[PDB]
Design a protein around this ligand. Structure first.
Ligand SMILES: [Mg+2]
Ligand SMILES: [Zn+2]
Ligand SMILES: [Zn+2]
Lengths: 94, 111, 99, 221, 170, 147, 1112, 14
DNA sequence: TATAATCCCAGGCTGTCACGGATGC
RNA sequence: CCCUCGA
DNA sequence: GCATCCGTGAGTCGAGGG
């Protein structure tokens, strides 16, 4: 079971809304090279390699964890799309 | 644009003809040696489209620099072969005939 | 011939995604190699192999396009081919595409 | 602590009938005509049967298998029909705003027609659990408000109150009365029974219903 | 008929947590193959994609580092398991895979009830969701551990049965 | 279902039966363009009726009509649904004749078209939701405030 | 080892030859061993007799025929993919009615496929079996009118084809109606056409009250037979001019013509017996001296009227009765197709007779054998009852040949077959096996023939019974039909007998299938044996009477699925048929006569007999069968051995010393183990892999062709463009893989090069070409490689070349090469195991020997079965097999326990006791007492009530052993299991279903032509189908993007999928999907129907999904 | 119904 | 391109049921 | 597509 | 208003074989 699923499901008015928020954030992180993360270095999910701990390649995990943090804001009609896109590309170039 | 709807209606002979890229005159498939589409046959490239990407039948225009250009000699447009899945043919009947769906589907609409 | 009724029959015309990706990566890598040259010699190679308008020009036409003699443009083609050979022997990137 | 008795009682495996076949008599059997033989098998698989008894049992077995197959086919069909008729039903909003509802009876007329008796627990649960009350209900000093999703406990409580003769029927929001277009609303539908909570908007309850009816269909004897 | 879908015989891993399934190495390799190629380029196991694909083309040309790379690939992601016939939505469930030697798919003991899967030689199909949307959909919604109750009855579908009940009773 | 020892929540059956009661038959046209004995959806006839009462016209007198799931599925407003179920010929002919438009309301339609279904993550309710971190949100808030 | 056999029942007669149904049928059909003038009127002889003479040369007549020698032997046929057949020569003579000229010549009619010694066929190199079909026996039947209670329907049924089904009914208005080809007309008319007058019909039918009044119509008797005939012709043939000779021709052809109308001989006899009349011919009437004469119809109507009125001695008929159903064997079916082909040839003959010179003609010029050849060829190739043989083990073949199908041509169509036809009828007793039948849709349609059962010449099935006179059971064996059986009272075979006399004053018997308690004096007959009531397979299940029918069925069906093992053993417990089955299946070699064995070799066995002659038997070795199982015969004898007649010379596949060996004999313990055996799964000891238990040889045939093209010929070569020596290493000079080489997926069996198609080099290709300064070669690599997940060692290569002796291939094809790749398959995870009792499952775990629960003396069990299987499955036989198997393990002996005459409990108890005395006492003599753990488990047993309190540890342990349970030590701990565990020897088989064959995965690959959706099937490297129901799943979950993904990027969306793979391999997220191509196919296929399909926006303005490509 | 027979009639008219 | 020919491709060959709709006393 | 065999 | 013939339905996935 994905950790804190009860909490995430408690956050929203529909489970599917959660799914969308998560997937969108995952694509955001994948697009900006994770640089936009609200996670502190100790809050970073880790993959255990042959060598040692590395970052977690799965953006969805990251997204759900970030969503757990309560540092993300979700909703409809918060910002025009293009403006958001270019603000993110300005803050975090790819 | 975004597709919000799908309509299905009856097709006029004028509509049908306006779809068609040519009328197939002959009941011929392919040449029994060269294995190529017969002229005014069911597979004819003059109508439906080129067999090879951006290449005519005779081979006069082989490149993308010619697009929309119809070869004069073999009468084949130079374009993507994929259109052979798309472009419609047609057959003009001497005497008109009845679409059987509007005949034998009870109760008969025509009837 | 016999009736299709056919589901055991593959489609041999259309490219598989593998082939598509292969051609894509080949074009990209070729642009990488041609970027390591000067724009004129790269353009000469492109016009000689037909990467620009789709067809291969003769020496007189490339020479008339850049404004030089056929011998000159042929020699430019040669030195470009040579530099590409050197960069190929060095990097060995394109080898895989020779099948 | 006998293994048969253990597995049977715990529910791990086996049932009273199969066990009885393993121990006591095999029992009566059917003729191919659906008629019953007058002479039962006195044997158990422990004892072993006569070729005759075994033969009768083969009648029965064959009939059974056939039934199972043909049934599977028809059930598949029904399921497909159902999916096709319900597929556009999806929860499209929170409230249709309907004042309409249905009243779920806790009592059914006796076969003796002597009086009304309490409906079986499971039935009541299936008609009640996870539903929204369309009206305020005051019973056993407990206040059940309009807009309350009945929990399992709420339902048990209502059964109790029924046994006390306080309430014979429970008003509830139902898709039968739901005025939502091209689907149902949140309230009228119910719990999302997988999550035991109010259903998320956008859940497709048509396919759910269809499948839910479908799967046991193959089991219906 | 879809790309990125294999099938094999299912066997019961008891050792699986509810959210997991045994996925054979070969199968997992072929299904994730593009991701495996990309990850192979990210590492030094191959200069480029094509060389890596040709590398995987023959079985004796396959080394161990590619398996580790594959392990790096599938991290956090889930696949989909399905048994035919599919009677209800639980006929398909999401499982975070775990690579196993051998050709058999290892399934969790509980979820069997929802699949109506014993092992007589039943076989199941696998599917790899591609996008991040597909993945989030699978993990938040279609995850096995996330549906413990029948959407029909509202009773737990995943519950102890057979051996488990037997032991606890004993 | 009970008799066989299968627990099944009534609300599903209620959904289906609701789809069975979906249609009505006209016992009188009133001031509308409808014909006596014409069969249509209860929703549509009630909408038309409220439109006539609001207009002051005579309402359409109608009767409840119960049909099985098969006929009802074939009777749906979407011809892509009906054609993809059974009686394909009949459906396609009658639909073409009427020049009927499929509004792509249901799932099956969009499945055929390969589109995104109107349920779950594809529901218009939740699919327009946006995700923004406080840093980006504040950057945008400054860009908004400065103009 | 010694084999102890149980049971008090003495079988009087042995089992008849099993394959004899096939063999006798086909031989009786061909009569090749019969001189042409001694042949009877049946078979292909019947075919010739029916077809010829051909009139209107004016006359072409049949003299006789013959069968020649096969152009090739069997093994050669299989090798070269030819058919095993004999040339058919027939003698015809041409006779002009006028000239008197007689021209006579022997004509070649083509070839007739020949049946091998075991009862199979070889068609185009593939062994095949012809399955006997069941149907309604021809005759006259009467069944109650379902609509009208008290009334009835007479039905006259001919052979399949051979005539119309005729129904007779009494209509509501009272008239007698006749239905033919779905046409209702008064029978009175036809009766008049037969020449009947009201007088004869009134005296005949008048007795039955006011029945005959419905037969009375004055208008009919007011006209002579001619007028009535023309009338009926007008009734049956609207639009057809009622010319007299035309009507006579049609009607005669429809009823009195033996050529186009034939009842079965069985149909004839049954009609006679039912109606109490005698049939001269096989038709319903005759044409004699210009007029039609009655045979059937009047007695039929008389019987019908008698049945209707309630006239005594008249009854309806069971159409599922085994007396009213008959079996059409291979000879009869072959006869029919042969007949049709011959008639086609006759049309050809007449059509040739109307043309050409009327003077010069020969039987050669007239006869074209082509349609006959095509007819036979179609019967042995594309027909229904001709099936790919099941060779997996000998038993599979035997049963296959013993099958009975109700489907096929002339048979029931599926989904039109309900319960009545699928049911086990009371007369199935000793005839059709009540057990063996497929699971699922086919249940009840495919059945098997009983062991002692026989099919007679009339197509009916007979079962043996013993004559009982005055309470004395003789050895006289009377084979009875179902009706004959229904005439008597028959006691059970287990009936107590002192000598030949009935010992019991109360005996169990059957009257018309109904079980009844009777006196010895009332017993007419007696069962031969229990074996007679079940099939071959079902007779291989020990303790059958302890097994529930279903799991028994699975027992049989899975027995036929068993893969032959290298180490295979006959079961520790046997039913006694494990020998005969090997014999009749011709799997094992036998000594022809008495004599001395001259030589013994792997490839050869030479025997000198009492005659002095030296006979060499070649040995079949490592031969691949239909299903991929290896067939090889191991010599069982030593040089100079003295053999008698019928002694075993060599063991074939899956046989141990003349006994049938399918699976293995292992040591099982039935306990749960750590949830690995949860739900039918099984746990096995790794030791089984060590000693090569459950290991089999599997061969896989591969084939590639080199053909002539228009771009130039393909050729087999060792020169393959762009391949390293590493790739070509195991290839020989010609390009063929060497014998004995190990091949892995990706390896090349046969190198091949094909000239490239027309290639317009893309600018990238030209640039790269110029860069590497290498010319693109003419050919390309088409070479046959190894399918992923397959491989092995190469046993053989077969090369066929055009222009070489004895070799001619299909047009356009140069050369054909076949590579035979075999393998040795160790038991592994996912492989399926099963027993004769129906317990089945996959191996989920293989434990190292130290983890296996073991005996106190340190003997680890082989296989761990979960007990939870047994109770609901209700098969207890496996248990008894396990106990007696344990006693056998210790006493070192096997057993023969007949079915329903068994080894009962007490005897197994005694045997078990002896087994204990071996198992324990040895230890006490070894200077060891009882272990502490054993004492604990004994305490637990006392608490379990499994032992008696107060007895010594030894006595209690023995008390546990007679219960077949023993102390078992967990290998991970050393601590005992808290209770005693059942442990013994069980017979467990490896089935054909193995994970090596079934594992498949796909990323991308081949797509279908039109739809551009991926292919399917493993061999084609196909993708899994995501069905409607799966879409229902994803929809119910409400996962939109996963579904959409499945609908586009995964399957038919080409832009989507190419861009997808490209996106992933670049480490980019996948792109938004576009319209699936199959939708475009839908649109265009609707347009071809003249339907306009328009994709519109919200403004109803058209949106082109074809992007302008389809628009001018 | 049947084209052949119908044509035979139509031809039989002359 | 020249006796005279003038209405058939035969295939016949059967054990389901339920619903809707047109058709016939 | 038919058969046969698996679930 | 009530019988009768015609048309259309009748589980999924997988395997092998022709
Ligand atoms: Mg199973
Ligand atoms: Zn051209
Ligand atoms: Zn509502």
């Amino acid at each position: 079971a994905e950790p804190g699923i009860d909490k995430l499901f408690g956050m929203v008015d529909s489970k599917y809304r959660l799914t969308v928020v998560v997937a969108k954030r995952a694509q955001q992180l994948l697009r900006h090279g994770f640089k936009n993360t609200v996670l502190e270095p100790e809050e970073r999910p880790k993959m255990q390699t042959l060598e040692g701990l590395f970052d977690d390649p799965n953006a969805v995990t990251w997204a759900m964890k970030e969503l757990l943090t309560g540092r993300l804001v979700f909703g409809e009609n918060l910002v025009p799309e293009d403006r958001l896109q270019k603000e993110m590309e300005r803050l975090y170039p790819v | 644009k975004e597709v919000r709807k799908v309509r299905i209606a009856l097709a006029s002979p004028e509509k049908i003809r306006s779809w068609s890229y040519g009328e197939v005159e002959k009941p011929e498939t392919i040449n029994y040696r060269t294995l190529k589409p017969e002229r005014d046959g069911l597979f004819d490239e003059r109508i439906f489209g080129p067999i090879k990407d951006y290449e005519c039948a005779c081979g006069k225009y082989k490149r993308q620099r010619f697009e929309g250009k119809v070869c004069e000699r073999c009468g084949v447009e130079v374009t993507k072969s994929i259109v052979r899945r798309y472009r419609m043919g047609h057959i003009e009947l001497a005497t008109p005939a009845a679409h059987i769906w509007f005949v034998k589907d009870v109760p008969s609409k025509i009837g | 011939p016999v009736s299709l009724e056919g589901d055991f029959i593959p489609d041999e015309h259309l490219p598989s995604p593998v082939d598509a990706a292969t051609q894509s990566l080949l074009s990209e890598e070729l642009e990488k190699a041609l970027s390591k040259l000067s724009e004129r010699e790269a353009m000469v190679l492109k016009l000689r192999k037909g990467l620009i308008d789709g067809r291969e020009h003769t020496l007189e036409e490339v020479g008339a396009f850049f404004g030089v003699t056929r011998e000159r443009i042929r020699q430019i083609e040669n030195k470009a081919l040579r530099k590409l050979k050197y960069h190929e022997s060095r990097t060995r990137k394109l080898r895989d595409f020779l099948d | 602590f006998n293994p048969l008795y253990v597995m049977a009682q715990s529910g791990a495996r086996g049932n009273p009938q199969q066990i009885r076949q393993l121990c006591g008599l095999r029992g009566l059997m059917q003729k191919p005509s659906g008629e019953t033989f007058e002479v039962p098998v006195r044997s158990s698989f422990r004892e072993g049967l006569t070729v005759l008894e075994y033969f009768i049992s083969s009648h029965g077995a064959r009939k059974g298998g056939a039934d199972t197959a043909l049934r599977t086919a028809d059930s598949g069909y029904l399921t497909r029909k159902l999916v096709d008729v319900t597929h556009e039903i999806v929860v499209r909003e929170a409230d249709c705003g309907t004042t309409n509802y249905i009243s779920v009876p806790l009592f059914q007329p006796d076969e003796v027609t002597r009086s009304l008796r309490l409906r079986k627990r499971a039935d009541i649960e299936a008609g009640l659990y996870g539903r929204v009350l369309a009206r305020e209900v005051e019973v056993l000093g407990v206040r059940l408000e309009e807009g309350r999703y009945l929990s399992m406990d709420d339902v048990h409580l209502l059964i109790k109150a029924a046994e006390a003769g306080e309430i014979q029927e429970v008003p509830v929001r139902s898709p039968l009365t739901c005025q939502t277009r091209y689907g149902v609303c949140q309230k009228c539908y119910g719990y999302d029974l997988s999550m035991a909570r109010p259903v998320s908007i956008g859940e497709a309850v048509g396919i759910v219903a269809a499948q839910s009816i479908g799967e046991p269909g193959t089991q219906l004897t | 008929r879809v790309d990125y879908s294999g099938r094999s015989v299912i066997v019961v891993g008891p050792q699986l947590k509810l959210h997991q399934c045994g996925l054979p190495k070969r199968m997992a390799l072929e299904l994730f193959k593009p991701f495996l190629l990309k990850k192979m380029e990210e590492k030094g196991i191959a200069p480029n994609v094509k060389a890596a694909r040709r590398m995987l083309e023959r079985q004796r040309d396959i080394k161990d580092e590619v398996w580790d790379a594959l392990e790096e690939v599938i991290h956090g992601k889930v696949v989909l398991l399905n048994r035919a016939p599919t009677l209800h939505r639980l006929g398909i469930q999401a499982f975070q895979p775990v690579l196993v030697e051998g050709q058999s798919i290892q399934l969790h003991p509980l979820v069997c009830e929802a699949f109506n899967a014993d092992f007589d030689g039943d076989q199941m199909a696998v599917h790899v969701p591609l996008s991040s949307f597909a993945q989030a959909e699978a993990r938040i919604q279609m995850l096995s551990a996330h549906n413990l109750l029948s959407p029909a009855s509202g009773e737990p579908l995943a519950k102890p049965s057979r051996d488990i009940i037997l032991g606890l009773y004993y | 279902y009970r008799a066989q020892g299968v627990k099944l929540h009534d609300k599903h059956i209620e959904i289906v039966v609701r789809q069975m009661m979906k249609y009505v038959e006209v016992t009188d046209p009133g001031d509308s363009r409808l014909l006596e004995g014409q069969v249509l959806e209860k929703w549509d006839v009630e909408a038309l009726n409220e439109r006539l009462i609001a207009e002051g016209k005579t309402p359409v007198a109608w009767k409840p009509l119960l049909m099985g799931v098969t006929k009802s599925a074939l009777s749906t407003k979407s011809w892509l649904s009906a054609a993809s179920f059974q009686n394909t010929t009949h459906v396609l002919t009658e639909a073409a004749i009427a020049g009927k438009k499929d509004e792509l309301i249901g799932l099956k339609e969009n499945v055929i078209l390969g589109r995104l279904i109107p349920a779950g993550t594809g529901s218009d309710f939740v699919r327009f939701t946006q995700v923004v971190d406080q840093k980006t949100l504040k950057a945008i808030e400054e860009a908004r405030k400065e103009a | 080892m010694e084999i102890k056999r149980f049971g008090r029942i003495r079988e009087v007669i042995p089992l008849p030859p099993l394959t004899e149904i096939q063999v006798e049928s086909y031989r009786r059909a061909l009569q090749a061993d019969v001189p042409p003038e001694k042949r009877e009127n049946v078979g292909i002889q019947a075919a010739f007799r029916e077809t010829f003479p051909i009139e209107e040369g004016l006359v072409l007549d049949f003299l006789e025929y013959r069968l020649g020698e096969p152009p090739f032997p069997q093994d050669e046929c299989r090798e070269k993919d030819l058919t095993y057949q004999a040339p058919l020569y027939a003698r015809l003579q041409l006779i002009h009615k006028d000239t008197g000229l007689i021209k006579e010549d022997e004509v070649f009619l083509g070839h007739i496929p020949l049946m091998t010694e075991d009862g199979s066929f070889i068609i185009n190199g593939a062994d095949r079996v012809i399955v006997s079909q069941i149907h309604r026996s021809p005759g006259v039947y009467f069944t109650p009118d379902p609509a009208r209670p008290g009334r009835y329907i007479a039905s006259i049924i001919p052979l399949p084809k051979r005539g119309p089904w005729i129904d007779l009914e009494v209509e509501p208005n009272g008239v007698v109606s006749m239905k033919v080809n779905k046409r209702k007309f008064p029978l009175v008319l036809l009766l008049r056409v037969l020449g009947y007058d009201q007088e004869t019909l009134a005296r005949e039918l008048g007795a039955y009250g006011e029945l005959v009044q419905g037969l009375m119509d004055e208008s009919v008797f007011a006209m002579r037979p001619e007028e009535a005939l023309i009338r009926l012709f007008t009734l049956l043939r609207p639009g057809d001019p009622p010319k007299r000779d035309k009507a006579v021709a049609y009607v005669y052809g429809l009823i009195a013509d033996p050529r186009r109308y034939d009842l079965g001989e069985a149909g004839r006899y049954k009609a006679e017996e039912k109606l109490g009349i005698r049939l001269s011919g096989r038709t319903l009437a005759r044409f004699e001296d210009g007029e039609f004469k009655d045979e059937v119809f009047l007695p039929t109507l008389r019987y019908l009227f008698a049945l209707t009125a309630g006239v005594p001695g008249h009854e309806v008929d069971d159409i599922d009765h085994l007396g009213n159903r008959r079996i059409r064997t291979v000879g009869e079916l072959m006869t029919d197709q042969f007949r049709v082909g011959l008639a086609r040839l006759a049309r050809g003959v007449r059509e040739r007779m109307l043309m050409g010179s009327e003077d010069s003609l020969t039987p050669a010029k007239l006869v074209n054998s082509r349609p006959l050849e095509a007819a036979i060829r179609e019967f042995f190739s594309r027909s229904q009852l001709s099936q790919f043989k099941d060779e997996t083990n000998p038993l599979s073949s035997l049963r296959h040949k013993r099958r009975i199908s109700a489907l096929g041509p002339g048979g029931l169509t599926r989904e039109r077959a309900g319960f009545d036809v699928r049911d086990v009828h009371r007369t199935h007793y000793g005839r059709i096996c009540p057990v063996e039948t497929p699971e699922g849709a086919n249940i009840g349609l495919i059945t098997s023939l009983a062991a002692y059962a026989r099919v007679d010449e009339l197509g009916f099935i007979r079962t043996p019974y013993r004559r009982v006179v005055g309470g004395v059971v003789t050895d006289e064996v009377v084979y009875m039909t179902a009706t004959e059986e229904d005439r008597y009272t028959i006691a059970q075979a287990n009936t107590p007998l002192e000598g030949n006399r009935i010992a019991a004053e109360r005996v169990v018997a059957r009257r018309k299938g109904e079980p009844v308690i009777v006196s010895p004096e009332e017993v007419e007959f007696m069962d031969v044996s229990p074996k007679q009531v079940f099939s071959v397979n079902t007779n291989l299940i020990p303790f059958l009477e302890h097994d529930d029918a279903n799991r028994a069925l699975m027992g049989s069906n899975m027995q036929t699925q068993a893969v032959p093992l290298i180490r295979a053993q006959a079961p520790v417990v046997m039913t006694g048929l494990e020998e005969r089955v090997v014999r009749d299946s011709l799997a094992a070699l036998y000594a022809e006569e008495d004599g001395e064995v001259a030589k013994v070799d792997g490839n050869r066995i030479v025997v000198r007999y009492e005659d002095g002659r030296l006979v060499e038997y070649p040995l079949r070795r490592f031969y691949r069968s239909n299903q991929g199982t290896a067939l090889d015969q191991r010599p069982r004898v030593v040089v100079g051995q003295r053999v008698r007649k019928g002694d075993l010379l060599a063991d074939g596949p899956a046989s141990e010393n003349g006994f049938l060996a399918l699976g293995q004999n292992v040591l099982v313990a039935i306990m749960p183990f750590d949830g690995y055996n949860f739900e039918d799964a099984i746990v096995i000891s790794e030791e089984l892999l060590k000693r090569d238990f459950y290991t089999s040889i599997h061969i896989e045939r591969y084939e590639i062709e080199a053909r002539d093209t228009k771009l130039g010929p393909e050729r087999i070569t060792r020169d393959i463009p762009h391949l390293s020596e590493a790739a070509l290493r195991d290839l020989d000079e010609e390009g063929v893989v060497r014998i004995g080489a190990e091949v892995k997926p990706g390896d090349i069996l046969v190198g091949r090069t094909s000239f490239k198609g027309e290639s317009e080099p893309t600018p990238e290709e030209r640039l790269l070409r110029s860069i590497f300064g290498e010319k693109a070669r003419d050919v390309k690599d088409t070479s046959l490689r190894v399918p992923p997940g397959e491989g092995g060692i190469v046993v053989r290569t077969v090369r066929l070349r055009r222009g070489d002796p004895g070799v001619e291939l299909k047009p356009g094809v140069r050369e054909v090469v076949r590579v035979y790749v075999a393998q040795k398959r160790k038991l592994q995870v996912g492989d399926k195991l099963a027993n004769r009792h129906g317990n089945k499952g996959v191996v989920a775990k293989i434990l190292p020997v130290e983890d296996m629960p073991h005996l106190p003396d340190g003997t680890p069990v082989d296989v761990i079965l979960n007990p939870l299987g047994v109770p609901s499955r209700m098969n207890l036989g496996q248990i008894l097999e396990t106990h007696l198997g344990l006693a056998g393990y210790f006493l070192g002996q096997r057993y023969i326990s007949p079915i329903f005459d068994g080894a009962k409990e007490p005897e197994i108890k005694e045997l078990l006791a002896q087994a204990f005395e071996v198992y324990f006492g040895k230890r006490k003599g070894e200077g060891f007492g009882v272990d502490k753990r054993e004492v604990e488990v004994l305490r637990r047993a006392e608490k379990l009530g499994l032992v008696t309190p107060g007895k010594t540890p030894e006595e209690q342990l023995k008390e546990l052993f007679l219960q077949g349970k023993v102390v078992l030590y967990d290998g991970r701990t050393g601590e005992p299991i808290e209770g005693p565990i059942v442990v013994g020897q069980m017979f467990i088989m490896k089935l054909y279903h193995m994970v090596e064959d079934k594992m498949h995965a796909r990323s991308t690959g081949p797509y279908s032509l039109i739809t551009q959706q991926p292919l399917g099937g493993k061999a084609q490297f196909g993708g899994q189908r995501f069905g409607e129901m799966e879409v229902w799943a994803l929809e119910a979950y409400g996962a939109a993007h996963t579904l959409q993904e499945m609908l586009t990027l995964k399957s038919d969306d080409i832009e989507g999928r190419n861009a997808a793979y490209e996106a992933i391999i670049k480490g980019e997220d996948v792109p938004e999907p576009s319209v699936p191509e199959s939708f475009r196919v839908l649109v265009k296929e609707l347009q071809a129907l003249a339907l306009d399909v328009q994709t519109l926006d919200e403004k109803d303005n058209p949106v082109d999904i074809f992007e302008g490509l389809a628009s001018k | 119904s049947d084209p052949v027979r119908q044509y035979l009639h139509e031809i039989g008219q002359v």
